[PDB]
Amino acid sequence: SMDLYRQSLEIISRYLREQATGAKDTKPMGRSGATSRKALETLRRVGDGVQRNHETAFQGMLRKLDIKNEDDVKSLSRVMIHVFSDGVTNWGRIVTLISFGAFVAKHLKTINQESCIEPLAESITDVLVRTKRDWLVKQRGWDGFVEFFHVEDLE
Ligand SMILES: Cc1ccccc1-c1cccc2c(CCCOc3cccc4ccccc34)c(C(=O)O)n(CCN3CCOCC3)c12
């Protein structure tokens, strides 16, 4: 889906870019902006927690990947599908994919590979929308993501 890819890329690239730079993007959101803004807010809350709680595993995975240049970033796509396409599909695994994406984006800045952040964001969005299309549609896309992590109103 064109609209699902577009919205997912906007959310994912905004999170990875602001995690690496330390500064939010003031540029307005495109189509379905209200959902995208709520999704980015949820991603910041949940995603920052995932990076803190799974720091040892994220450091371990980053070391195994041994990312040194732009060719290594292009090959990340096949490692992503090997790990992500094996087993169950849920929002927890999706937030892990994106959160590790931000952890990798920060490392990319450190090694002067900031130009690889946007192709990284596109690769993550590609793996997500291409492999989990049907599941994402059944779960109401990004509205479903926001609702899933919304627990303060359970009573
Ligand atoms: C949290 C955890 C705990 C214990 C060990 C590893 C992890 C762990 C670490 C990192 C990411 C994930 C994912 C996201 C998908 C891969 O993301 C990428 C892979 C490769 C490159 C990527 C690049 C950019 C963005 C995502 C990339 C999952 C997941 O799919 O849940 N896990 C758990 C992995 N399981 C462990 C048991 O063995 C079965 C697999 C991950």
Cα of 33 from ligand 1 centre, angstroms: 29
Q: How far is the CA of 80 from the centre of ligand 1 (A)?
A: 8
Ligand 1: residues with CB < 6 A are 54, 57-58, 61, 65, 76, 79-80, 83-84, 93, 96-97, 100-101, 104, 124
User: Alpha-carbon distance 128 to 131, whole Å?
Assistant: 6
DSSP secondary structure of the chain: -HHHHHHHHHHHHHHHHHHHHS----SPP-TTHHHHHHHHHHHHHHHHHHHHHTHHHHHHHHHHHT--SHHHHHHHHHHHHHHHTSS---HHHHHHHHHHHHHHHHHHHHTT-GGGHHHHHHHHHHHHHHHHHHHHHHTTHHHHHHHHT--TT--
Please answer whether residues 108 and 67 qualify as being in contact, where contact means their C-beta atoms are separated by less than 8 angstroms.
yes
Nearest CA to ligand 1 atom 23: 101
Q: Ligand 1 centre and the CA of 96: distance in Å? A: 7
Q: Given ligand 1 and candidates 61, 76, 104, which is best to mutate, with the most ligand atoms within 8 Å of its CB?
A: 61
For residues 43 and 36, give the distance between their C-alpha atoms in angstroms, rounded to a whole number.
Answer: 10
Tell whether domain 1-149 is in CATH 3.40.109.10. Answer: no
Buried b (16+ CB within 10 A) or exposed e, 116-131: bbeebbebbbbbbbee
Distance 155 CA to ligand 1 centre (A): 33
Integer Cα distance of 145 and 125 in angstroms:
15
Q: 45 vs 16, 31, 93, 134, CA distance in Å?
A: 14, 23, 16, 26
Nearest-CA residue for ligand 1 atom 41 is 96
